[PDB]
């Protein structure tokens, strides 16, 4: 718990980070640091993107690196890291 | 491709692709089991393909790696000695990567097939010839193990048993060369196989033609090849032209040409003059285009050497095999007298042909009993540096000078 939380706080220790959220497909985040309605809504949105990306991967190659898939867009480098038990979605910056 | 180009050749699309590519480029810019490089990567006899429906009572005839895809082995079998009812002779294949012992196309041949090789010019098929006067083509596309088409076994084609054949010309313009025991140089049209595209009754030394038992051509020099002889008169076979044929009767042995390939190692020093040869007289010598006599030799084993076809990267290594059942890979830059990589097969059985892979990554070996054994040939000896290629060429020149010096010493030191 505290190990994963410290790892998240270290990866998001970069200044200006939009938000690093340990997430879930259930529409709520495992560990987020944003506004609660926005965090739950973005958790559901990332759940939808995660299901679509999982189907896309299984269509392309069903044995790929299916534990993380970032979105390094200019707005937020959305580092989705869906684990096997939990999940993560880190809307991060393009710098660090 | 017009729509693909127009999607590519849109100005906005091109600018967006340039910006995204530059941004992405700037953003994104056991060991002991691996410890057999100099002690096993050059010789790792692994793939023992032996189809008992074919391997038993049969020998190995020749071998090659397919240029279209080197993951397989395009090799034939010799005359099945004890199969009066069964097929006379066919071709097996063991994939290098995939572990499938069955050949993807067991082209069973009615006669005894002489030799064969794959062809990437029309990569759907394989080609070969017979030990009774036929050359046939079979394809992995078809579903018949018999020959898809046959060259006309008449005066036009190789009447005698033609043991060597090669598809002269790449996919640009292919004309399957055939050389007969009766010396019928026959560049055959790979598409129209009714009659060969060329019918040249090759001969040398005042039309007293020799038995061309080992055909070889320089890499890319489609106008000149090299033909071995049973009488040893390996004369440089010009391939293109009116007077094309075996001209310079360089004699660098004392027996029939066992197996000879053009020593076409590639690097800084272009050794296209040299050509590795093997004799029936246990005389593995280095004949060359300039060196009318054998430049340097090797006569270690008592029995006759099987064949010689060095790898196409390092001029130092002379890939061959001993008649007493052992490999023979002598690296010239490593040693000049003793055979360097004289690996020994299990049971010391003889072979009649062997070949490095088309990439040089593995040097397989045949068997008299038919057990096709493939030995990996890694970068310990086959990785030629440009300096190492140049070093081997300079060592060859120094050895030529030393041979001239030793000949002079013998000439001036013979007590007469």
């Amino acid at each position: 718990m505290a190990e994963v939380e410290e790892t998240l706080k270290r990866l998001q220790s970069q200044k200006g980070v939009q938000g690093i959220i340990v997430v879930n497909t259930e529409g709520i985040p495992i560990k987020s640091t944003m506004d609660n309605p926005t965090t739950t809504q973005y958790a559901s949105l990332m759940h939808s993107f995660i299901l679509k990306a999982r189907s896309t991967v299984r269509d392309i190659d069903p044995q790929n690196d299916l534990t993380f898939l970032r979105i390094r867009s200019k707005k937020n480098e959305i580092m989705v890291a869906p684990d096997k038990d939990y999940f993560l979605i880190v809307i991060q910056n393009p710098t660090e | 491709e017009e729509e693909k180009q127009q999607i590519l050749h849109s100005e906005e699309f091109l600018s967006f692709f340039d910006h995204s590519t530059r941004i992405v480029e700037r953003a994104l810019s056991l060991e002991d089991k691996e410890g057999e490089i100099q002690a096993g990567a050059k010789l790792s006899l692994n793939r023992q393909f032996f189809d008992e429906r074919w391997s038993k009572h049969r020998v190995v005839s020749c071998l090659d790696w397919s240029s279209q895809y080197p993951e397989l082995l395009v090799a034939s079998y010799n005359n099945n000695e004890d199969a009066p009812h069964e097929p006379d002779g066919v071709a097996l294949v063991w994939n290098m990567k995939y572990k499938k012992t069955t050949p993807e196309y067991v082209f069973h041949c009615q006669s005894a097939v002489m030799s064969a090789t794959f062809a990437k010019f029309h990569p759907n098929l394989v080609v070969g010839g017979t030990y009774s006067g036929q050359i046939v083509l079979w394809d992995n596309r078809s579903n018949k193990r018999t020959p898809v088409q046959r060259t006309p076994l008449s005066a036009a084609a190789h009447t005698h048993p033609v043991y060597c054949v090669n598809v002269v010309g790449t996919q640009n313009a292919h004309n399957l060369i055939s050389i007969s025991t009766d010396g019928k140089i026959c560049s055959w049209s790979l598409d129209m196989l009714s009659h060969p595209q060329d019918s040249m009754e090759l001969v040398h030394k005042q039309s007293k033609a020799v038995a061309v038992t080992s055909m070889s051509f320089p890499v890319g020099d489609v106008n000149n090849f090299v033909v071995g002889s049973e009488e040893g008169s390996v004369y440089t076979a010009c391939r293109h032209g009116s007077k094309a044929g075996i001209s310079e009767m360089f004699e660098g042995h004392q027996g029939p040409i066992t197996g000879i390939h053009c020593h076409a190692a590639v690097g800084a020093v272009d050794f296209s003059h040299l050509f590795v040869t093997s004799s029936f007289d246990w005389t593995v010598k280095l004949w060359s285009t300039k060196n009318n006599k054998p430049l340097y030799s090797f006569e270690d084993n008592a029995g006759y050497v099987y064949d010689v076809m060095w790898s196409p990267t390092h001029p130092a290594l002379f890939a061959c095999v001993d008649g007493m059942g052992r490999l023979d890979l002598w690296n010239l830059n490593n040693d000049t007298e003793v055979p360097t990589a004289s690996i020994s097969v299990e049971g010391n059985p003889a072979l009649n042909r062997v070949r490095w892979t088309h990439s040089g990554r593995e040097i397989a070996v045949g068997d008299s009993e038919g057990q096709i054994v493939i030995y990996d040939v890694g970068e310990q000896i086959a990785v030629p540096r440009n300096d190492e290629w140049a070093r081997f060429g300079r060592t060859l020149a120094e050895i030529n000078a030393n041979r001239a010096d030793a000949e002079e010493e013998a000439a001036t030191r013979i007590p007469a």
């Binding site: - | 018949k144 018999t146 046959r150 008449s154």
Partner: protein
């Protein structure tokens, strides 16, 4: 015929033509007989 015959080349050509035709017919008949035997076995083993 005989080896001393002056039409030895045409006789060899005719023998070759006959051999090639027989081989092609044998191969085609083998394929067709495999198809027919498969059809008969399927009819015998089919559902009602």
């Amino acid at each position: 015929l005989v080896w001393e015959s002056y039409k030895l080349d045409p006789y060899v050509q005719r023998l070759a033509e006959t051999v090639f035709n027989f081989q092609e017919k044998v191969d085609d008949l083998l394929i067709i007989e495999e198809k027919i035997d498969l059809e008969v076995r399927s009819l015998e083993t089919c559902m009602y």
